[PDB]
Amino acid sequence: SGFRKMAFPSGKVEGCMVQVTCGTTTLNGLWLDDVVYCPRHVICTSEDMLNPNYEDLLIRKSNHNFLVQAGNVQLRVIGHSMQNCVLKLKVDTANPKTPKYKFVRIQPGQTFSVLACYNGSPSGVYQCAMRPNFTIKGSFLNGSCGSVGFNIDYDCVSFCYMHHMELPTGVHAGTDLEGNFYGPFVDRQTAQAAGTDTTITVNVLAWLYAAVINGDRWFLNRFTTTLNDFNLVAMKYNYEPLTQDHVDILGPLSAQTGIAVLDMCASLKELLQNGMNGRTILGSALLEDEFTPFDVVRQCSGVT
Amino acid sequence: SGFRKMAFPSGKVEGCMVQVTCGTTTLNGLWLDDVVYCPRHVICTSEDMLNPNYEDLLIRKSNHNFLVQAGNVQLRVIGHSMQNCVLKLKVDTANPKTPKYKFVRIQPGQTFSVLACYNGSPSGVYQCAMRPNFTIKGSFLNGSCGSVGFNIDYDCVSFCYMHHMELPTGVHAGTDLEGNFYGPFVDRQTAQAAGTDTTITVNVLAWLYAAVINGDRWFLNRFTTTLNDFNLVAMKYNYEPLTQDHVDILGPLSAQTGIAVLDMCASLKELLQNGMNGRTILGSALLEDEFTPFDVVRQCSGVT
Numbered sequence: 001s002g003f004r005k006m007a008f009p010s011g012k013v014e015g016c017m018v019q020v021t022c023g024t025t026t027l028n029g030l031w032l033d034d035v036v037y038c039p040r041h042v043i044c045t046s047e048d049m050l051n052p053n054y055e056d057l058l059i060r061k062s063n064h065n066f067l068v069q070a071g072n073v074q075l076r077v078i079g080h081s082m083q084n085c086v087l088k089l090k091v092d093t094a095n096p097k098t099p100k101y102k103f104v105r106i107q108p109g110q111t112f113s114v115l116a117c118y119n120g121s122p123s124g125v126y127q128c129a130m131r132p133n134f135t136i137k138g139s140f141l142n143g144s145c146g147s148v149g150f151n152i153d154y155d156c157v158s159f160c161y162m163h164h165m166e167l168p169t170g171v172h173a174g175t176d177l178e179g180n181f182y183g184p185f186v187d188r189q190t191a192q193a194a195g196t197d198t199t200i201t202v203n204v205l206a207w208l209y210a211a212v213i214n215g216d217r218w219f220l221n222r223f224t225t226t227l228n229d230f231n232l233v234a235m236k237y238n239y240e241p242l243t244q245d246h247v248d249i250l251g252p253l254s255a256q257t258g259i260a261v262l263d264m265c266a267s268l269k270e271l272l273q274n275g276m277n278g279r280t281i282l283g284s285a286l287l288e289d290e291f292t293p294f295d296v297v298r299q300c301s302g303v304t
Numbered sequence: 305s306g307f308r309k310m311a312f313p314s315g316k317v318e319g320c321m322v323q324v325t326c327g328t329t330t331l332n333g334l335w336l337d338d339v340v341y342c343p344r345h346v347i348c349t350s351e352d353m354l355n356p357n358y359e360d361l362l363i364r365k366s367n368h369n370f371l372v373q374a375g376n377v378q379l380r381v382i383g384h385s386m387q388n389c390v391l392k393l394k395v396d397t398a399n400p401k402t403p404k405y406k407f408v409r410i411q412p413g414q415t416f417s418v419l420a421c422y423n424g425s426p427s428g429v430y431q432c433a434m435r436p437n438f439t440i441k442g443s444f445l446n447g448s449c450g451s452v453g454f455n456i457d458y459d460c461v462s463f464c465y466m467h468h469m470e471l472p473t474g475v476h477a478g479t480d481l482e483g484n485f486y487g488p489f490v491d492r493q494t495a496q497a498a499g500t501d502t503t504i505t506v507n508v509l510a511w512l513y514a515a516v517i518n519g520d521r522w523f524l525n526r527f528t529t530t531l532n533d534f535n536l537v538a539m540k541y542n543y544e545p546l547t548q549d550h551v552d553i554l555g556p557l558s559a560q561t562g563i564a565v566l567d568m569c570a571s572l573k574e575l576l577q578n579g580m581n582g583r584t585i586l587g588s589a590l591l592e593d594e595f596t597p598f599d600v601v602r603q604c605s606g607v608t
């Protein structure tokens with residue numbers, strides 16, 4: 001028993017981290033097979049960041065300008081190319097520590113682990129969610145760019161995020177491993193609207209099921225609701241509208257606890273309308289939305 | 305910017321995890337050099353757990369009864385010995401992935417990362433604190449025994465915890481790597497008093513400094529307090545009494561923010577007396593005590 005904001009073991013990803021330096025800028029790269037992936041803004045200077053002409057900046061660079069170091073050993077760059085907002089540096093050596101991997105584009109509301117890195121060296125690992133507005137509330141400092149987000153299924157690492165930028169609001173933006181930004185963001189030093197965020201309803205419900213499984217039951221009530229009625233409350237409290245597809249993915253947790261999804265919705269409705277009244281659920285005094293239904297079953301069943 | 309419950313990268317520890325089976329029981333072992341460490345209750349059956357005579361149970365076992373598997377390869381056991389509540393299985397092969405390591409006994413209130421494992425396979429990593437009452441509020445299921453807690457300083461892993469038991473209250477108990485339990489616990493299936501826990505005051509103060517560094521400042525007030533006055537409030541709210549040694553370790557954060565430790569104590573006093581009034585600090589609606597002053601500076605300075 002017990003429920004924690006658990007991240008995937010980071011070993012398979014640590015073996016892929018490298019340092020990439022171009023000119024005076026240093027950030028992290030991801031070395032998979034004979035390619036190193038990194039944010040294209042490694043080619044910029046501070047005078048460029050207001051609105052960089054990336055095509056022109058990259059034309060001034062040659063393979064030998066990209067210094068790639070894996071720990072203490074230097075990698076030889078034999079090609080470079082820009083794909084969207086990422087650079088792909090072909091190296092003459094395949095990473096011997098390349099795990100089985102995929103590049104995936106995650107949906108908003110899904111979760112992943114981040115391995116925060118500096119100078120190609122891992123500093124820490126944490127779990128987070130891609131917000132419905134395509135931002136992440138991470139922990140990153142200057143030099144963390146190029147750190148990646150991922151999920152692991154057995155021996156396969158599915159890379160879903162590469163960190164690029166911190167918006168003036170302190171929230172984080174990045175790309176998939178093909179260099180496409182999640183959300184409307186551009187890799188420029190400008191104020192950029194993130195847009196209205198919402199709470200991930202399906203994840204809050206999954207976490208209420210985790211709470212029941214792990215002994216916290218004070219919030220269960222004698223009530224039920226409908227999708228329509230619950231969605232009026234979700235509207236009022238800036239929660240994502242619940243659909244039958246969300247009810248369907250909550251099936252396993254509903255079967256495990258014997259609590260019908262709509263009955264759990266009625267508990268969530270009462271907590272939204274009345275608050276926690278000074279009480280806690282799984283060590284939290286707010287409704288947590290960073291655990292998906294899959295995360296709850298995985299943590300409550302010990303998948304390795 | 306941003307502040308997360310960050311765990312150490314687990315790679316160095318993943319390389320040490322093995323499966324240990326004795327009779328019908330399977331749990332995790334830690335393979336460092338030519339020794340595998342695991343909880344001694346691997347030698348028990350369910351009939352033994354009420355009050356096992358470990359000495360007698362171990363006398364019935366021979367080296368060949370301990371099956372140790374590192375991934376898919378079997379390790380040859382050439383010796384066994386019980387030290388306190390751990391077994392040390394000498395194997396004929398040094399773990400090639402042994403990192404630089406130490407065995408340390410952590411103090412209550414200090415934090416560490418846990419690599420939860422099942423059948424010698426890592427499942428997830430999370431950060432937690434050793435409670436003042438020597439329990440941990442972890443996330444562990446049946447088979448997680450033998451999972452370890454650790455801290456990393458550059459290339460050295462300091463192992464501080466090995467998981468042994470879940471108390472009937474759902475909280476966790478374990479040992480240092482010499483097999484000494486933290487707290488009064490014994491490795492028996494009995495109800496065992498954990499004793500009064502308290503909130504780690506120095507860690508709450510460190511997290512309030514982290515909040516100020518990362519932009520959350522609404523809780524700062526026009527007041528100051530003394531150690532004596534603050535400790536009367538700490539007494540009332542079941543917080544650890546603050547000492548000058550705690551004020552001294554908060555020095556760096558006080559210098560960084562320009563907020564005198566006693567001024568931050570006055571903010572903590574007001575939050576204890578008035579609550580959060582429906583507001584949050586670093587995404588939490590309660591006062592967080594799982595970040596030490598060292599953790600806050602490390603996360604806010606990007607140590608790798």
Ligand SMILES: O=C(Cc1cccc(Cl)c1)Nc1cncc2ncccc12
Nearest residue numbers: 041140141142164165166187188189305
């Ligand atoms: O945001 C940037 C640089 C930057 C500026 C403009 C556009 C792009 Cl694509 C990249 N770097 C950081 C990332 N994450 C966190 C940070 N924390 C502090 C300072 C810097 C951070």
Ligand SMILES: O=C(Cc1cccc(Cl)c1)Nc1cncc2ncccc12
Nearest residue numbers: 001345444445446468469470491492493
């Ligand atoms: O507590 C035990 C077994 C046990 C019983 C009595 C004494 C000792 Cl030293 C060990 N194992 C578990 C550990 N952590 C978490 C669990 N969650 C569920 C079931 C079992 C768990």
